[PDB]
């Protein structure tokens, strides 16, 4: 009866970059930060897989 509202998605806390990390739930926040940071450094290959 006290509850007024609820989170729309489980994703809303996280940004775009971090949303692309699969098992984020099992990853330390520091390592996850650098992961989201290195995805931005990824050079596209000849065959996009």
């Amino acid at each position: 009866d006290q509850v007024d509202y609820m989170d729309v998605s489980t994703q809303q806390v996280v940004s775009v970059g971090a949303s692309l990390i699969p098992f984020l739930e099992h990853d330390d926040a520091n390592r996850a930060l650098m992961g989201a940071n290195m995805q931005r450094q990824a050079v596209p290959t000849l065959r996009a897989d």
Partner: protein, 1362 residues
């Protein structure tokens, strides 16, 4: 050129003219069309020199034939263009201009000289007001300011016979008229008559200034500039960019400002302009010169084009970025390269993979050279083209040059000396540098993209210094601790662990082999496992009394695996070394053992062998990291629901009334901290063993071969702390403030945090990451302060022949001996023939290096205390003796004379801080502290020994302690100290002094949260000065109404209560004061900030009761963030807010005066008739009572001691040991091993200077501060010859000031505060003879240390003749 010293002094107007080669009259730079220098402009060729080599401007004389031929037509000398970087010019200023550095730089020289405040001088300079220069009529005296209206009054009445002027002309006249001699005598006469304490300093300082001014031969007028020097053109260049545009220095904009306004001033003087306009122009001229010298000091700096302030002269010297730190104390370097690093597991310890193309380029001159000696290259340009074409024969020549040629590898940051190492290079195809694994530790190298600098030592000398001193193989031990830095890790560890570790039966349990060869063949054949018990016959080789090795053959139960590792193990070592399951910790000991028994080459070979076998078996095994590895305890949910309803019950009790925010914070943190340990220990029992393997018939228990458990137990990678977060519970995380979040993370990484647990994790994570970026800065700033202070310290002598040293006892704190005496005195020169108990035969000699063998003898006899020779007590002037220092911990033998000890000390103290900043922070998330410091339980039976303790017996029957410093010890039978235990104040002891307790008994219980105020006397309780709202606060309850009192401190307190000390006073039934047993003191206990008293006034107390609970919020987290500021505070000698009081002079004391409650402790010694009287706070309670014969430095108050007071009363070894222990407390809390001798070096540098009383035969008089070495030199010649004896007193300097107090001004300038250092040196006319290292590095010379010590000592003896 080769010179002896450098001196700095004020520039005379005429001196400035000497350097100048002409007056630049015009702002003209160059001609827009012919981009050549304009007439008498800023780039004038007529003044600074020719633009092109041996060519005049108008072009009449060309070629090297024309030499010094000044062209008559244009007026340009035919010399090299180089001259335009060296020739200076000048500017004729219309008005005299004050030099900002002597005006604004604090304290200031012009102000201190005239004894005239800055404000007065400035009013004069900006032409607001006149100043009197001299009036024969005392009507107006000297230096008296007159406003515009004040000047009109005296001008009519007296006029003429009184001289008062405005602007820099006035101040220059005032400086010219001032007689340095006469004022010196007048000031000496003032000090003779009435020397007031604080103004004696200031008068003595102006006397020192006047004396120093006359001795320097500087003239005060010269502080005001009449001629202004101009920097040579090439040092403020106008060059064309590719785009056709030009680019120029900001000095050109500032010079043009000055010239325009100066020339306009000449004009307005020629034109006889009205005075208001002349004044404005003189203001603007001084503004422009002050902007040119030091922009930003004179207020708002002049912004150029972007808005950024123009970079002025001083700005190019001053900043870190100036010229000292950037271009002179370090530079960019030829024959330098870099690239990504990658592993070279195939390499030997002394080798590194160097890319082909990289090495081709670095050794270009060496190739050119061999190419011409083989006659393959006709000349250098053909050799260059052969290299450009990269011809096949060139590769073969390059291979020949690199052979036996060492290359330096460097990694940023270079924290300690092993951050540079030499290797023999191995040419490799590919662009990445290959690094040997075992040195990755010293570089802190991990291959996820780190890069390294390569440097080529060119000279034969540099090659030899690289191969002998800097080689990887030769730098095995660290400069800080004696432990080795080079050691196998990761795979090399995993492989050897897999080999040694044993399993149940397996293939071929209980088999008999004939040596390790049979074992290996069996394992390779596939009939035996590596972890299977098998009886083998190994033949170990043990060293005898001489150099001969004795051979011993015996049967010992072992695994196959360990037998095969024995094959790698050199003869001399015991088989017991390989017989355990090996981890990284055991392998490090293995290589150290081998080094000290067998020597360097065998350990080198053995190290390589360990690496090869380790990696080869690492791939043979096949360890993996599965998700099933991290097994969660079945009993987590129970522990957590229990812990969770518990914390819930305390939160509900919070609204009730037994709880402050601090108390509940402590209680919740304690509950979760114990829960975390519980779940972790559940996981580790369930994981570490919980291996049900059926032995040969029935079931057995043995260690688990779970992958993550093996990784943790071997010490290969993760610790138990990390695996807690994986498989157990993540725990309580700590905010960026350091205060810990009340809600812990119940989950682990295998379980998956949920959105809320992950979000809560973020705080700790990011504070960790921000910590690495930000704190490494203050860490690094401490490294640099330390280095500057201990640069000069070098081993100068072999033996000073001193007996003096500091008594080192074993660090036995917290039951388990923290640091053994043997290790603490391992590698030190023993002082004073210290034998065994029975004094009738010497056991140990005097000057003898404490080797591991001597140390092992010490342990059989169980010596507790040893006077050892230390750096601090060494007599050597201008350095320290090899014996006072002891072993070079990095070499493993006696230190070499000439070694730069100070640098190594500063680096080794600095490194751990800087490394522990980034390291613990990125790696951990949460804080795993454990606060449950309630009960002391004793581990081994013995009798209770209480030293320093004053306790009162309470009505319970129990001994309740009321001492501040209390040390419970555990004595055995023989009577040695083995366990220690710091009992606090407010403690209940189970048993009293000298009583027997059994193993596992609790001997004292105390509350950790709340330090109670415990009363000695019994009676009724009285509220003194405890006015509600003024000093305390009142808070009331329901139904009946329980009020509770909280003592508001002066922070929250009103102006009314400020002077009142609030205190619970003990009165009896009559309502008279109860006395404290045996003294005239009435009982009264002064309550500090927020002392929460429950029980309201008039309540009968018994003795030994808790009056008041002051809350003790310990929001501290266990990290270096909080430790390092304490380290910096000790090194810089930062006096605390409440210094500890100590006996000043020995003798017999009674009390005199009191200010309300403030004690005025009166010492009246026995022999020394003069008293010493101290004001003391009322609330600070004394350890001493009344008439006792206390000696110098007996502890009176409770509170932290100032290192100053320790040095000043007890002396050197006292204060040195205080610093060493207080610093080491912090570093030891973080698991950092630094030898005391390094800290001792820096304390020696702290105690460099000494103040002097009285005169000798030199110029001492009252209170000059001179260095200790130099006054000792004087005292040695004085004692032999006689003359006036001089009393001295050593002064402590904290690091920053100690580095600025060095008599080298080049070192002082390079360190910090450069503007101020150069003004004080320039005014003193100081002469730097270049003795220190920084000084010689700046002039680009040989260091007076290491290799350079030989050459440098040869120059010092060339000073005696020729």
């Amino acid at each position: 050129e080769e010179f002896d010293a450098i001196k700095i002094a004020l520039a005379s107007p005429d001196m400035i003219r000497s350097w100048s080669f002409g007056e630049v009259k015009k702002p003209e730079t160059i001609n827009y069309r012919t981009f050549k220098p304009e007439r008498d402009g800023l780039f004038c060729a007529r003044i600074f020199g020719p633009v092109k080599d041996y060519e005049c401007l108008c072009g009449k004389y060309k070629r090297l034939k024309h030499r010094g031929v000044i062209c008559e037509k244009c007026g340009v000398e035919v010399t090299q263009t180089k001259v335009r970087r060296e020739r200076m010019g000048h500017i004729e200023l219309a008005s005299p201009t004050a030099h900002i550095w002597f005006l604004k730089s604090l304290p200031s020289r012009i102000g201190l000289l005239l004894d005239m405040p800055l404000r007065d001088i400035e009013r004069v300079l900006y032409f607001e007001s006149y100043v009197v220069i001299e009036g024969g009529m005392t009507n107006l005296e000297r230096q008296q300011i007159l406003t515009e209206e004040q000047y009109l009054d005296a001008l009519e009445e007296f006029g003429d016979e009184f001289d008062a002027k405005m602007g820099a002309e006035a101040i220059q006249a005032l400086l010219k008229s001032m007689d340095l001699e006469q004022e010196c005598e007048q000031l000496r006469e003032e000090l003779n008559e009435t020397n007031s304490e604080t103004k004696r300093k200031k008068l003595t300082k102006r006397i020192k200034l006047l004396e120093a001014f006359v001795q320097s031969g500087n003239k005060p007028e010269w502080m005001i500039l009449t001629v202004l020097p101009v920097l040579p053109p090439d040092l403020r260049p106008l060059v064309p960019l590719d785009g056709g545009r030009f680019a120029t220095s900001d000095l050109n904009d500032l010079y043009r400002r000055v010239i325009n306004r100066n020339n306009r001033l000449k004009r307005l003087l020629d034109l006889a302009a009205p005075d208001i306009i002349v004044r404005n122009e003189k203001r603007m001229l001084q503004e422009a010169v002050d902007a040119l010298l030091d922009n930003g000091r004179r207020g708002r700096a002049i912004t150029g084009s972007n808005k950024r302030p123009l970079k002025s002269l001083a700005d190019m010297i001053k900043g870190k970025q100036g010229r000292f730190r950037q271009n002179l104390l370090g530079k960019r370097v030829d024959y330098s390269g870099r690239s990504v690093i990658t592993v070279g597991p195939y390499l030997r310890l002394h080798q590194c993979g160097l890319p082909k193309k990289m090495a081709l380029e670095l050794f270009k001159p060496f190739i050119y050279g061999k190419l011409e000696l083989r006659g393959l290259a006709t000349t250098i340009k053909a050799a260059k083209k052969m290299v450009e074409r990269e011809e096949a024969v060139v590769w073969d020549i390059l291979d020949e040059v690199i052979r036996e040629h060492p290359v330096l590898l460097n990694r940023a940051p270079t924290l300690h000396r092993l951050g540079i190492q030499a290797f023999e290079p191995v040419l490799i195809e590919g662009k990445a540098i290959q690094l040997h694994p075992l040195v990755c530790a010293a570089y802190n190298a991990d291959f996820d993209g780190d890069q390294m600098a390569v440097h080529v030592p060119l000279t034969l000398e540099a090659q030899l210094e690289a191969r002998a001193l800097m080689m990887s193989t030769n730098n095995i031990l660290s400069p800080a601790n004696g432990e080795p830095i080079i050691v196998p890790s990761q795979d090399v560890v995993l492989g050897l662990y897999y080999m040694t570790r044993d399993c149940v039966n397996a293939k071929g349990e209980g088999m008999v082999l004939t040596g390790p060869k049979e074992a290996e063949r069996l394992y390779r054949s596939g009939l035996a496992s590596l972890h299977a018990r098998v009886k083998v016959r190994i033949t170990e080789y043990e060293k005898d009394a001489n150099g001969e090795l004795v051979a011993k053959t015996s049967l010992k139960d072992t695994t196959v695996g360990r037998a095969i590792l024995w094959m790698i193990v050199p003869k001399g070592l015991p088989y017991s070394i390989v017989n355990q399951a090996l981890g990284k910790k055991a392998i490090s000991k293995m290589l150290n053992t081998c080094y000290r028994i067998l020597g360097l080459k065998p350990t080198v070979i053995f190290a390589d062998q360990i690496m090869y076998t380790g990696f080869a078996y690492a791939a043979r095994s096949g360890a993996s990291v599965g998700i099933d590895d991290m097994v969660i305890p079945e009993k987590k949910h129970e522990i957590i629901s229990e812990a969770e309803a518990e914390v819930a019950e305390i939160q509900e009790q919070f609204q009730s009334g037994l709880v402050t925010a601090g108390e509940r914070y402590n209680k919740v943190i304690d509950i979760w901290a114990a829960a975390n340990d519980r779940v972790s220990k559940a996981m580790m029992d369930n994981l570490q063993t919980e291996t049900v393997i059926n032995r040969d018939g029935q079931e057995e228990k043995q260690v688990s071969f779970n992958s993550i458990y093996m990784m943790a137990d071997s010490g290969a990678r993760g610790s138990a702390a990390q695996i807690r977060q994986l498989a157990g519970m993540r725990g309580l995380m700590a905010k960026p403030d350091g205060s810990i979040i009340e809600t812990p993370i119940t989950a682990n990484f295998r379980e998956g945090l949920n959105v809320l647990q992950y979000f809560i994790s973020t705080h700790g994570a990011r504070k960790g990451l921000a910590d690495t970026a930000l704190k490494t800065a203050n860490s690094g700033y401490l490294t640099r302060r330390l280095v500057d202070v201990a640069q000069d310290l070098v081993v100068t002598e072999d033996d000073c022949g001193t007996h003096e040293g500091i008594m080192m006892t074993p660090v036995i704190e917290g039951g388990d001996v923290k640091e053994p005496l043997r290790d603490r005195v391992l590698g030190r020169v023993t002082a004073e023939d210290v034998l065994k108990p029975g004094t009738a035969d010497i056991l140990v000699p005097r000057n003898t290096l404490l080797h591991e063998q001597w140390c092992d003898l010490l342990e059989e006899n169980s010596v507790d205390a040893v006077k050892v020779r230390s750096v601090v007590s060494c007599d050597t002037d201008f350095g320290v003796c090899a014996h006072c220092y002891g072993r070079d911990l990095a070499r493993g033998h006696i230190i070499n004379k000439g070694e730069a000890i100070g640098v190594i000390a500063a680096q080794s103290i600095g490194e751990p801080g800087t490394q522990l900043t980034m390291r613990t922070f990125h790696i951990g998330g949460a804080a795993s502290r454990a606060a449950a410091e309630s009960s002391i339980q004793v581990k081994n039976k013995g009798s209770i020994k209480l030293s320093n303790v004053k306790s009162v017996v309470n009505s319970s029957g129990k001994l309740v302690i009321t001492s501040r410093n209390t040390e419970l010890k555990l004595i055995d039978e023989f009577g040695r100290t083995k366990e220690s235990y710091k009992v606090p104040y407010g403690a209940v002891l189970a048993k009293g002094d000298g009583e027997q307790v059994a193993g596992g008994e609790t001997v004292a219980n105390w509350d950790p949260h709340t330090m109670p105020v415990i009363t000695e006397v019994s009676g009724f309780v009285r509220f003194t000065d405890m006015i509600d709202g003024q000093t305390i606060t009142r808070q009331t309850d329901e139904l009946t109404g329980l009020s509770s009192l909280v003592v508001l401190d002066s922070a929250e307190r009103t102006a009314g209560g400020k002077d009142l000390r609030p205190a619970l006073k003990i009165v009896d039934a009559q309502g008279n004061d109860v006395l404290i047993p045996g003294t005239d003191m009435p009982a009264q206990y002064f309550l500090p900030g927020k002392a929460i008293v429950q029980l309201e006034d008039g309540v009968q107390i018994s003795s030994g009761d808790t009056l008041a609970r002051i809350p003790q919020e310990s929001g501290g987290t266990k990290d270096i963030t909080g430790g390092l500021p304490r380290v910096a505070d000790l090194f810089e000698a930062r006096r605390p807010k409440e210094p500890a009081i100590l006996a000043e002079i020995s003798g017999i004391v009674s009390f005199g005066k009191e200010t309300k409650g403030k004690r005025r402790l009166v010492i009246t010694p026995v022999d020394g008739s003069d008293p010493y009287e101290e004001m003391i706070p009322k609330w600070r309670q004394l350890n001493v009572f009344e008439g006792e014969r206390v000696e110098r430095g007996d502890v009176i108050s409770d509170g932290p001691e100032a290192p100053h007071d320790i040095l000043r009363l007890r002396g050197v070894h006292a204060v040195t040991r205080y610093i060493v222990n207080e610093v080491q407390d912090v570093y030891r809390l973080q698991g950092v091993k630094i030898n005391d001798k390094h800290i001792e070096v820096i304390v020696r540098q702290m105690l460099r200077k000494a103040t002097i009383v009285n005169a000798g035969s030199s110029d001492f008089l009252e209170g000059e501060q001179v260095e200790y070495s130099r006054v000792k030199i004087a005292n040695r010649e004085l004692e032999a010859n006689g003359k006036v004896g001089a009393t001295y007193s050593r002064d402590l300097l904290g690091i920053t000031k100690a580095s600025l107090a060095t008599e080298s001004f080049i070192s002082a300038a390079s360190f910090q505060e450069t503007t101020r250092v150069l003004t004080e040196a320039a005014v003193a006319g100081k002469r730097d003879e270049l003795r220190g290292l920084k000084e010689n590095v700046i002039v680009g010379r040989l260091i007076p240390a290491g290799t350079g010590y030989a050459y440098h000592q040869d120059r010092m003896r060339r000073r005696a003749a020729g």
